């Protein structure tokens, strides 16, 4: 915070003559100098404004709802990665539908699920170590294909600075409990499952490794992160009967 | 502009000896210093070149065709947003097809519609105010779902600096009068409508608010902005008969 | 002027994701850095705000009315100053009252004369010279005291950069045609003169010199500068009869 | 605050040899460099010391006693100003004498009123507005002159950054309850009024406007601010009888 | 001083070709760069030129005549101030008239006393102390009011850096031996005293303290400082008879 | 240009006290700082003033008279240069005398030809190329020596930044139509030619190439540039008879 | 060298949208800033471009041919210089003609000797010394004048940083084996000598000293340095017969 | 020195208002900025204050008494060092005791010899040389061991910038004429010698060389430097008898 906002100093009148605080006058001079510098670089900004950057989805619009799923420890050898989850498509749908619906009900407002993200969050199990986390994934395969429990690292994704990676699971492929802007209806998992076209094909298979030259022991927290926009009317909630 | 481009100074020869302008020689020295600095930071740029940014679609490739649709005034209470449009899917398609085709015909070149954007452009109705604009939207719902006229603000999109927001309406969902690279054929709205699979489901529902602590009065201009790439041959237009 | 005010760049939405112009984001970063610097120096400004400076009366409040009186040439020897005017108190009052009233009538608004200033404005009569102007003055004396036409310079006032000096003639001493906030009444010079208590005592005696080591030839323009504040009602002027 | 004042580091003696902290020695070196810079700019300060600035009267010597008088709301059209007060000279004296004497009694010390200031303090009645305040005033007029309630703005005083203007009411013109350095005597308003020579002539007439292009609603707090210097002896207060 | 003024270098002609010193040419280049910078900040100065500062009266126009009056030692307790002088109005006038007239006669030129200043000059009586001086004053009181010899400090004036304070004694209140621009006449103290209207009311009562937390011993030199402008004609002084 | 020259701000006098604009006072402070810096580097300039540079003859004294001679296109292979002109000494003298005399007559003032320069001016015949121009020359040879039309490049002169090279043809070698400071007499080419001692020996043979790795097509403009100083008396031209 | 020239980064297209490398975009921004700075200083360069400097003849056009002549050791006392060579004019011509012709034959191309330079190159004969070299010379004298072997130093030439001095021997005075642009003819020294007008008058007499306060021992290498421009046609050399 | 210490500017009082010099106010602002910077780096100094440096013993506490012993010239070959002194232990004690006692008597105060230092001071015997001095030493050996007069240099001590090296001779090993804090007694060399336990073992053997690649001739001054602290009472010296 500031002390005076930007209303520093004052003014008074003596014998028709007008006095103003010296520090405020010096700010006016310095602000004029800055205003001149703002105009000198405007054409430079116009060059930079040929391009755009993307707002962080998790700090940006929509609320975050973190449906944590499970925790797990793995020990990973150097230059390898270990599989984090090996659910079938049906088991992943059971967890997706069951954990979100039971956590969120009652859903009392119209809302739309903007995106579904698979969240991998990693932390060391020992102090005084120095290394970074890597990641690889796939999202679909023959239902009778069983993934290797451990693979060698090859051009992996490098996990970001806070040791979190979030992978978007697009509506193309992965089914949401709430498709569009809607109120909830009566629903159940069997209805949900039956209306998914390819329940057994899509399922996140995620691997985790490090950049260490020794074995490291890792704690993993896995979550589904829903981005949600609500459409709550500007009206009161009354006890029945109303009025 | 510059005065001399970068051809400052000159040269002459006196008694076999070659003279060159002092200012040009001082530029050669300064350019060598800069060249050395360019090489010192090259490895730093290589780090930055691990990442990429996205060209502004409206300043970038393709031409812009702004099909303005209507204007509207709303008064919006603090912490709320008011609905801008409430067309059914059919009415939105009538406006989309009718306004674009009638504005653009005759379409005399092969062309492709790259993208369709919904443009929301906002301006204050009073001077001496200080506040910013916010936005929320949805794109589909049950045809018998009628959107709330006013909602409370919750994690909205913050409209950009020039008080314009443009929302992409992807070919996935929203139907275009010209699908691919094509010449025009004979067409009409009934043919168009009949070949859209889900005419009644998709329709932009957009809300507008502010960051003000008082009621504000807003003027809204809504447009469809088409990005178009043309394929005009390098040939003459002659009066018939040719040659 | 600027090109974009401070509304540089824009924003758009693609697949729920929000893009903003890179140059605008870089300005937001730079403005945060400046905001931090503004807070670091606030305590320094608080020290400077212990003192105050005075607004230029001629660029400040009240309008200026320059009643030019006469012009005059003098040649001045080094280290001396020559007298500019030698009116008695009555002759100065005749010029003061006559020149202001005749120039300003009709005076159609309530108004107050804030201050009366004696303006000395000097310009060289030869090019390619380099020197500055000096000034000395007195404001009252025995009516039978006649001032020396030329004096030696001793600790004079150094005229300011634009070769103008303006000396305040305070209501204490010098009589104004309009004393307070008033409408005009029927008036004449004899009424005015008779109501001045000491008409013969007060009169500006002003001398002019230079900082040159040679004789210089100077053109002098002498004026009375009135500072006036008007109280014009917010009402129409109609042709009689009104309504 | 600081942590160590300027007594950083220490010293010890080993085998006749004297050790001192490295950071303190580096400060001694840096202070010598600064001392050298202080001497390089001394002649520059001597140039600046040809001029002087004025200490803020309200942060400077004498105590402040704010006798608030009343509050008021005005709505002011663009380019106009509205009258704040329209008291006669007698009514202004009644408020001046009554409010100060009743607030301050018992006055138990010798003291002098240094100055009397008319304080105008302004604040917006709506949030999210951006504009500044302007002021105009007069101090005397025919007692049967009634000021216009609203005037058009013409070269006004621009109120200072904190939205306060303070206008000096000099002893020349405006009468004080305590004239010089004195103890209080028995006094009353009738005695006070009778000894003022021109009670009906002097009275502050103050107008307020803005720099806005819309109507704005303003809250006004008006006060008399007395600057007072006390002469309290360095002696005890005892319960009677003393000693 | 400089060595070459600003006439560094030279020029010569060889075979029609003109050579100039390299250092002078480099100054011409640097001066052009500065000239460009002078124009970049001109608009900033125009902002600062909205305000004005006041020339030091003692370094400014008019000569200084320091009529020292007396010296005095006081010991002052912390948070208190001791009275410096306690003359009646008549005794102060005797010292003012007697000391100035006897010091200055013969007064051989026309002159005007611009201002009269009361000078308080303070110096420590012990070395190796660190503290500053404070001041408070009054200028008039009932003739039978006797000032307290010691008062507690309350919002005092902080003496300036050189341990001098000078208080203006205006013609309004305090009588001068020479009123306006005049030659001297035959005069004496009785004539002077009799023509002062209120001889017994006005008299400077000045107090001195410190910012020390211990008792300090102070040496005080008190003077009247006259600012004088002379009007000496540009004529010879001859031995009589002239010519 | 500047707005105020260096006469920014002003001064006025209030109650003997002298006010000056704050921006002007801040310039005085900054100029003192610069004056101090000017003296710190004076000894450095004295080192640079041990050497001298040469004024551009074409921007320097004497007027320029460009007698263009012809234009020509050449295509030049990489690492080669092509001959620009192959006149005998007599043909070069015919062009030199004929083109200058016919262009300049009537020559109505006393004047001296300071220098004669051969001007080679080059420009590309295609856009979007990047290369520089080179030059080689000789000035005399056996009259029956015929120069090679194309030579390989070997340590050539690199043409200056503006693609002009000017080669001095000294009076030693090359004959001028006007030898010294003179009025014109009756003259003709035969008289001129007969008085040249070695008409057939001296003749500029100039070659042009590039720094390109491809063939380039060049447009060449060749001129004689005369530097002339005139001695025109300060007298009127009258219609005959005079007076 | 650089790694990427100035082609850093790349571009790709995803869903009509265009991405470019961040480092390249940051270079574009920085280059725009530099371009703006280039235009700010252009007027400053125009001032510097009033003057010119001279290209180093030995790094500049024409090839260098160093005909070393002899080596010599001298011991030189402080403040003195010793003679380096004392040839008559004939002996200097024998060395000049004989050493150049025998070194350079066969001369197979048309060429011109641009300049002849006398090269003095000096090196210390002891390590761990610190001093500089000085030079003085003359170029002609009565043939029966014999130069002093040692002279006292008086305003000498200070040899340049690399301990080489090169003195131009102009065609005016000193005769060249090849006068103009020519092929070689049959020639011999007697023919050459007989056609020199003043063989016995011109001869370089050069002296060498130091800035040391002790005796120093110096090794001297003396050479004639010819600057030569060749005119080699762009044609093949074939074995006879050609074609 | 400075001109004003840090008491620049002054203050005065006009109409209750307090003026202070502008340059002093600008210093107050700049000092506040510096005070803020002092607090920003305090934590950095705390890091540096983890370590300590040692006061130069010769500029530090205790007085210096330089008992010069002898002078000597040596010529030293490259990469070698020559012996400076070859005294036995007894001869070194004779010089140490005899030279100090005879130089210093009468010793009239209580005092302690803090340290004894062997001083080697070197200077070149020729000008215009560039090289540095090296040193090696030993302090004890078998009395019948005779040191080599010249040794090859191997990892020597590099003499400091002023060409002085001072080697501490500790009380452990080397005997002092005054052991502790004492008055002098009657003493002689035989008493001194007899009470030294190992007179023949300890003796400084010092060698000197250079970093030159040539022979150099060196002048050597060798001294014993005593550091002494005196305990002189604060009492008068009277002529006997006292009082």
Q: How far apart, in whole angstroms, are the C-alpha atoms of residue A29 and residue E45? A: 8
Do residues D204 and D167 lie in contact, with contact meaning Cβ atoms separated by under 8 Å? yes
State the Cα angle at G73 between G67 and G76, rounded to 5°: 125
SS3 assignment, position B47: helix
Which residue in C7, C19, C20, C23 has the most chain A C-beta atoms within 10 A of its own C-beta, making it the best mutation to test that interface? C23
Instruction: Check: CB of residue D164 under 8 Å from CB of residue D111.
Output: no
Best of E23, E32, E35, E37 to substitute, by most chain G Cβ atoms within 10 angstroms, is E32
Å from F230 to nearest chain E CA? 14
CA-wise closest residue to E41 among C42, D45, F24, C161: F24
- Distance separating alpha carbons of residues C93 and D170, to the nearest angstrom: 28
Report the distance separating Cα B68 and Cα C194, nearest Å: 77
CA A32 to the chain's CA centroid? 41
According to DSSP, the β-strands at G51-54 and D150-152 are: unpaired
Tokens representing C32?
């945060």
Question: What tokens were used for H21?
Answer: 């010099």
Tokens representing G29 are 């921004």
D-proximal residues of B, 204-223, CB under 8 Å: 212-214, 216
What was the structure determination method? Answer: X-ray
Dihedrals φ, ψ of A75, to 5°?
A: -105, 130
Burial class (CB in 10 A: 0-12, 13-18, 19+), F152: middle
Task: Tell me which of E6, E50, E61 to substitute to probe the interface with C (most C C-beta atoms closer than 10 Å).
Answer: E61
Q: In angstroms, rounded to a whole number, what is the distance separating the alpha carbons of residues E95 and F68?
A: 94
- Find the helix packing angle between F22-48 and E22-48, rounded to 10°: 170
Closest CA to F84 of F178, F192, F223: F223
C36-60 CB burial, b ≥16 within 10 A, e <16: eeeeebbebbbbbbbbbbbbbbbeb
Q: Chain A partners of C227 at a C-beta cutoff of 8 Å?
A: 16
Q: Can you tell me the distance from the alpha carbon of H221 to that of H217, in angstroms, rounded to the nearest whole number?
A: 14
Distance from CA of A234 to the nearest CA of D (A): 22
Give yes or no for a contact between C55 and A19, defined as CB atoms under 8 angstroms apart: yes
- Write out chain B residues lying below 8 Å of A57, CB-based: none
Contact: C150, E231; criterion CB under 8 Å: no
The alpha carbons of chain F give a radius of gyration, in whole angstroms, of 28
Assess whether the previous peptide bond of G92 is cis (omega < 30° from 0).
no
Q: What value does the CA radius of gyration of chain D take, rounded to a whole number of Å?
A: 28
Provide the sign of the torsion angle of the four alpha carbons F21, F25, F27, F28, taken in this order: positive
Q: Identify the chains in contact with D, defined as 3+ C-beta pairs within 8 A.
A: A, B, C, E, F, H
Whether A42 has its CB under 8 Å from any CB of chain G: the answer is no
Which residues from B are below 8 Å from A61, CB to CB? 136, 155-158
Chain B residues whose CB is inside 8 A of the F206 CB are: none
Quick check: E44 and A25 CB within 8 A? no
Q: Are C151 and C84 in contact (CB under 8 A)?
A: no
CB contact under 8 A, B23 and G57: no
Distances in Å between the Cα of B1 and the Cα atoms of B5, F161, G36, G40, G42 are: 8, 19, 10, 11, 11
Is some CB atom of chain C closer than 8 A to the CB atom of A36? no
Nearest CA in chain G to A46: G29
Is E166 in contact with H9 (Cβ distance < 8 A)?
Answer: no
Chain G residue whose CA is closest to A43: G32
Nearest residue to E79 via CA among E129, E126, E148, E134: E134
- H37 interfacial to chain C (CB closer than 8 Å): no
Q: Report the C-alpha gap between G121 and A200 in whole angstroms.
A: 90
| Distance, CA of B62 to CA of G16 (rounded, Å) | 9
Residues of G in contact with A43 (CB under 8 A): 32, 36
Task: Say how far apart CA C166 and CA C157 lie, in whole Å.
Answer: 11
Tokens coding H185: 């007694």
CA distance H15 to chain C (A): 15
Task: Please check whether residue C62 is in contact with residue D155, taking contact to mean a CB–CB distance below 8 angstroms.
Answer: yes
The residue count for chain F = 243
- DSSP summary character for residue D134: E
- Closest CA in chain H for residue C41: H33
Distance CA H197, CA H173 (A): 10
C228 touches chain A (CB under 8 A): no
The overall longest dimension of chain H from CA atoms, in Å, is 96
Whether the CB of B124 is below 8 Å from some CB of chain D: the reply is: no
Give the SS3 label for residue B66: strand
Nearest CB to D166: which of A7, A12, A21?
A12
Task: Give the mutation candidate from D54, D61, D74, D138 for the C interface (greatest C CB count, under 10 A).
Answer: D138
- Write out the two tokens for F214: 């491809």
Most C-contacting residue of B48, B160, B206 (CB-CB within 10 A), to test interface: B160
Task: Say whether residue D160 is in contact with chain A using an 8 A CB cutoff.
Answer: yes
Query: How many Cβ atoms are within 10 Å of C27's Cβ, its own excluded?
Result: 21
Please name the residue that has the structure tokens 């204490």: C172
* Break sites following residues in chain D (C–N > 2.5 A): none
Cα separation, E75 vs E215, in Å, equals 7
Distance CA C139, CA C127 (A): 34
| Cβ–Cβ gap A10/D160 under 8 Å | yes
Q: Which stretch of DSSP H or E encloses residue H32?
A: helix H22-48
E55 contacts chain F (CB < 8 A): yes
For E22, nearest residue in chain F (alpha carbons): F52
Interchain CB contact of D48 with F (< 8 Å)? yes
Rg (CA), chain C: 28
Cα distances (Å, whole numbers) of residue E181 to B51, C138, C205, E108, E114: 83, 7, 10, 13, 10
Instruction: Evaluate whether C69 touches C223 at the Cβ level (below 8 Å).
Output: yes
For D77, what's the count of Cα atoms within 13 Å in the CB-facing half-sphere?
Answer: 9
- Chain E CB contacts of G44 under 8 Å are 29, 32-33, 36
Six token digits for residue F225:
């540039």
Residue of E nearest to C207 (CA): E231
* Distance from chain centroid for Cα F53: 16
Q: How far apart are CA D39 and CA D13, in angstroms?
A: 35
Report how far residue B220's alpha carbon sits from residue B84's, in angstroms, rounded to the nearest whole number.
8
| Location of structure tokens 């040659």 | B243
**The pair of three-digit structure tokens given for residue B101, joined into one six-digit string:** 């085709």
Gap between the Cα atoms of C205 and C136, Å rounded = 9
Closest CA to H117 of H103, H102, H146, H96: H96
Tokens of G63: 């090839």
The single-letter DSSP state of residue C43 is H
- Radius of gyration of chain A measured on its C-alpha atoms: 28
Which residues of chain E make contact with F3, given a CB cutoff of 8 A? 42, 46
Q: How far are the Cα atoms of C67, C85, C124, C207, E207 from residue C210, in angstroms, in the given order? A: 26, 17, 11, 11, 44
To the nearest whole Å, the CA of G33 is away from the closest chain A CA by 6
The tokens describing B48, both together, are 């930055």
Rounded to an integer, what distance in angstroms lies between the CA atom of residue E71 and that of residue A191? 107
Q: Closest approach of chain E CAs to the CA of G37, in angstroms?
A: 12
CA distances from E177 to A168, E170, E184, H160 (A): 95, 13, 10, 74
**Chain-chain contact of G29 with A48 (C-beta, under 8 angstroms):** yes
Total residue length of chain B? 243
Cβ–Cβ of B156/A233 closer than 8 Å? no
Chain C residues in contact with F13 by the CB 8 A cut-off are 137, 157, 165-168
A51 touches chain G (CB under 8 A): yes
The answer to whether the beta carbons of residues D95 and D223 sit under 8 Å apart is no
Interface E:F, ≥3 CB–CB pairs < 8 Å: yes
Backbone phi, psi, residue D191, to 5°: -55, -50
Q: Give the residues across from E164 on adjacent strands.
A: E121
Three-state SS sequence of F2-63: CCCCCCCCCEEEECCEEEEEHHHHHHHHHHHHHHHHHHHHHHHHHHHCCCEEEECCCCCCCE
- Residue H178 DSSP label: S
Shortest distance between the Cα of D173 and any Cα of chain E, in A, equals 14
Measured at the CA of G185, the angle between CA G180 and CA G187, to 5 degrees, comes to: 100
Classify residue G67 as left (phi > 0), alpha (psi -120 to 50) or beta: beta
Residue B10 and residue F161: Cα distance in Å, rounded? 5
Distances (CA, A) of C102 to C94, C106, C187, F209: 12, 9, 12, 82
Q: Does any CB of chain D come closer than 8 Å to the CB of residue B127?
A: yes
Measured CA to CA, the distance from residue A60 to residue A54 in angstroms comes to 10
How many CB atoms are closer than 10 A to CB E195? 10
Q: How far is D35 from chain H (nearest CA, A)?
A: 10
Distance from CA of F101 to the nearest CA of E (A): 23
Resolution in A: 2.0
Say yes or no for a CB contact (<8 Å) between F25 and D48: yes
Do H70 and H183 form a contact (C-beta atoms < 8 A)? no
Of F4, F9, F12, the CB nearest to C166: F12
| Residue H33 to residue C51, Cβ atoms within 8 A | no
Residues of G with Cβ-Cβ distance to E27 under 8 angstroms: none
Tell me the helix, strand and coil percentages in chain G, rounded to 5. 20, 40, 40
Interface residue of G48, G49, G54 to substitute, partner E, most E CBs within 10 Å: G48
Residue A237 contacts C, CB cutoff 8 Å: no
Do C8 and C21 contact (CB within 8 A), yes or no? yes
Cα three-residue angle A191-A192-A194, rounded to 5 degrees: 65
């Amino acid at each position: 915070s500031l002390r005076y906002s930007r209303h520093d100093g004052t003014s008074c009148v003596i014998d028709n003559h007008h006095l103003k605080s010296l520090g405020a006058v010096l700010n006016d001079v310095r602000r004029k100098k800055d205003r001149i510098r703002e105009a000198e670089y405007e054409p430079i900004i116009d060059i930079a404004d040929q391009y755009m950057v993307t707002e962080d989805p998790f700090r940006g619009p929509g609320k975050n709802v973190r449906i944590t799923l499970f925790k797990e420890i793995r020990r990973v050898h150097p230059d390898t990665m270990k599989l984090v989850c090996n659910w079938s498509g049906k088991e992943f749908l059971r967890e997706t539908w069951t954990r979100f619906i039971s956590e969120e009900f009652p859903i009392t407002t119209d809302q739309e699920i903007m995106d579904l993200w698979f969240e991998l969050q990693l932390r060391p199990m020992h102090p005084n170590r120095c290394y970074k986390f890597t990641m690889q994934y796939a999202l679909g395969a023959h239902p009778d294909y069983v993934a290797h429990d451990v693979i060698r690292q090859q051009d992996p994704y490098y996990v970001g600075p806070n040791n979190i990676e979030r992978i978007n699971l697009s509506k193309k492929g992965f089914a949401f409990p709430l498709t569009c802007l809607q109120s909830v209806y009566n629903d159940n998992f069997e209805r949900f499952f039956d209306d998914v076209l390819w329940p057994y094909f899509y399922r996140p298979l995620v691997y985790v490794g490090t950049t260490s030259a020794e074995i490291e022991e890792i704690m993993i927290e896995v979550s589904l992160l829903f981005k949600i926009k609500e459409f709550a009317p500007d009206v009161p909630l009354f006890t029945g009967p109303a009025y």
